[PDB]
Amino acid sequence: DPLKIADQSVDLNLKLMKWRILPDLNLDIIKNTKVLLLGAGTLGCYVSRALIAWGVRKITFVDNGTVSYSNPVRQALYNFEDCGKPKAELAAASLKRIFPLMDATGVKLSIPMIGHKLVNEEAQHKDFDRLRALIKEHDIIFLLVDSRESRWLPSLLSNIENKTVINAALGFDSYLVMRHGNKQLGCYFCHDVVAPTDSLTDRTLDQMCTVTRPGVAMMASSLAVELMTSLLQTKYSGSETTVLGDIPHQIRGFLHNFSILKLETPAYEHCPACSPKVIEAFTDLGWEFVKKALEHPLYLEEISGLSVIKQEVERL
Amino acid sequence: DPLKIADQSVDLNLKLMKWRILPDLNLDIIKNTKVLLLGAGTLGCYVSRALIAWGVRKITFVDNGTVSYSNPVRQALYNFEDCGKPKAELAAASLKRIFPLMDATGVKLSIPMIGHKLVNEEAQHKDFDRLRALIKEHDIIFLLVDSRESRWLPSLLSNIENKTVINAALGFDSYLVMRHGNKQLGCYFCHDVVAPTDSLTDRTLDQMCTVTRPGVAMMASSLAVELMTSLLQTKYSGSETTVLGDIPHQIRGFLHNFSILKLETPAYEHCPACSPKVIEAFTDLGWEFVKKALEHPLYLEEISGLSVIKQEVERL
Ligand SMILES: [Zn+2]
Ligand SMILES: [Zn+2]
């Protein structure tokens, strides 16, 4: 039976990795990891391919988009004949074409961007609940959206549900891969991940630059998955390493000079996404809080305590 | 017309990259570059996807293999339904499914490994001529084979035909990407690219390790293509940089500690692949030379002058 053989083949490939090279490697915890991918664009496509090669069985894509004419060359699950079709379900179907016994599903769902007025209070209210449900349902959340403002709601919700989160963000010629965390590490929002004073091309990071160098998404996707697999391994006593090596908080890569930097950031007290007051506010008010924060980001800064900080500065 | 639109879409995406961010970027020289991929495995699949995103129009795959049951999860042009089919032509057909007006073709052809007796003097003689023809026909040669011994013949031939060559080689958790060159840089064979004293996992480099960490091939493929695109750009006066940044000779990446190293090596006088005596020998004797070198690698060392070096050492 060909299908059974294709199954036995991939688990076997992975077990030979373990016994030939890394006997301490825990492969089951990788296979049984339920993965949610927020974004079925270039990152979602490459991340999913890396995950299935590592034997991940359950992957869920979330995307509200449609396959465009320019998409297939950059986004590695789509063909020319797919143009027009809904992305998420297509992505899932494409995975099952590679590996038929995958538990891959697509959900067509929008993620509200902070700083934008709501278009349909009710529709997006539903979508909000639905998003929270998917996040609670899964084990690892990959945030693979095109901009900072689509990152906020899923970050908050992932923190609320205590899920490990892995962000990837692209600029023209550099990328960021970071984990938020299950001395706390701190999320994408805790600190400026890029300074107003840095390079012009570095400021394209997470601004839906549609014109990144093709290689950026490939590098970022594979590091993100390699970071996940290492992270799932037990840590060594007195060491931030596992059988697979390091588990950095953040990885920044640059194509122009072929470099990679690792760095770490503590959780910030007035973070708009993970600060205790923002949690407290969400826990007390729910969607009513979220809705106000979404349409009025400055409200978020009153809650976080960031405004009171900015005001004690002004007062000097 | 959908197809014409899909065409206009990708050239347009690339032109917006140029004018939004890098006005000096030469896109035509990338598009018109005839690319030969030696290997339609994991590297060939990922390299081709990166190339077409950069607008490369003509790609030729060369592989003697067949799609196996374990292949599709790691090798990104194949589906489960393709299992059994010949790889190279399948790879070409898969590219055209992504982007129909691609000039993509597959050639089923074996590359003889140095150190191995010939199985069919005549058949492989043909294949040798055919390989030389393909190399002369193309502009950039990517060496994406599974081991050192399959690298030798194409290296030699690429040097003979004065083609830019880009090698990628994988180990369990590290990779090497290098260009041979059009003070000469020196090829893959000029120096030990890994020492007998180094790590056990580092010695898996280019030994057809079938159990590399999935991310290794993704990283290596994208760097190799990003190296090619930069390399095709005019260099700045008094600087080893272009509009796209650096053009290192060699890039070594390591997953266990998420690092990348750049390094450079001069051409070696007694290289088995690029030394003047080996060139002279090939130019004088042709296939008769190649055949003897293939079955008897030690003959190669007499020719290169490497043996006389080893003997003056012994004599001390
Ligand atoms: Zn935070
Ligand atoms: Zn050499």
From Swiss-Prot, chains A, B:
One annotated Gene Ontology cellular component of this protein: cytosol
Impact when changing R213A: Impaired homodimerization and ATP-binding
A GO term for molecular function: Atg12 activating enzyme activity
Mutation effect (S174A): Loss of interaction with ATG8
Subcellular location: Cytoplasm; Preautophagosomal structure
Chain spans, region Homodimerization: 293-316
Positions of the catalytic residues: C209 (glycyl thioester intermediate)
Domain of life: Eukaryota
Effect of C209S: Instead of the formation of an intermediate complex with a thiol ester bond between ATG7 (E1-like enzyme) and ATG8 (substrate) or between ATG7 and ATG12 (substrate), a stable complex with an O-ester bond is formed
Motif GXGXXG motif in this chain: 39-44
Principal subcellular localisation of the protein: cytoplasm
Keyword list, A-Z: Autophagy, Cytoplasm, Protein transport, Transport, Ubl conjugation pathway
Annotated effect of mutating G41A: Loss of interaction with ATG8 and ATG12, and no more ATG12-ATG5 conjugate. Defect in Cvt pathway and autophagy
Mutagenesis or variant effect for R151A: Loss of interaction with ATG8
Gene Ontology biological-process entries: autophagosome assembly; autophagy; autophagy of mitochondrion; cellular response to nitrogen starvation; cytoplasm to vacuole targeting by the Cvt pathway; macroautophagy; mitophagy; nucleophagy
Oligomeric form and interacting partners: Homodimer; homodimerization is required for ATP-binding. Interacts with ATG8 through a thioester bond between Cys-209 and the C-terminal 'Gly-116' of ATG8 and with ATG12 through a thioester bond between Cys-209 and the C-terminal 'Gly-186' of ATG12. Also interacts with ATG3.
Family from the record: Belongs to the ATG7 family.
Entry domain remark: The C-terminal 40 residues are required for homodimerization, as well as the interactions with ATG3, ATG8 and ATG12; and the C-terminal 17 residues are required for the ATG8 lipidation. The GxGxxG motif is important for the function, possibly through binding with ATP.
Function recorded in the entry: E1-like activating enzyme involved in the 2 ubiquitin-like systems required for cytoplasm to vacuole transport (Cvt) and autophagy. Activates ATG12 for its conjugation with ATG5 and ATG8 for its conjugation with phosphatidylethanolamine. Both systems are needed for the ATG8 association to Cvt vesicles and autophagosomes membranes. Autophagy is essential for maintenance of amino acid levels and protein synthesis under nitrogen starvation.
Name of this chain's protein: Ubiquitin-like modifier-activating enzyme ATG7
Organism the protein comes from: Saccharomyces cerevisiae (strain ATCC 204508 / S288c) (Baker's yeast)
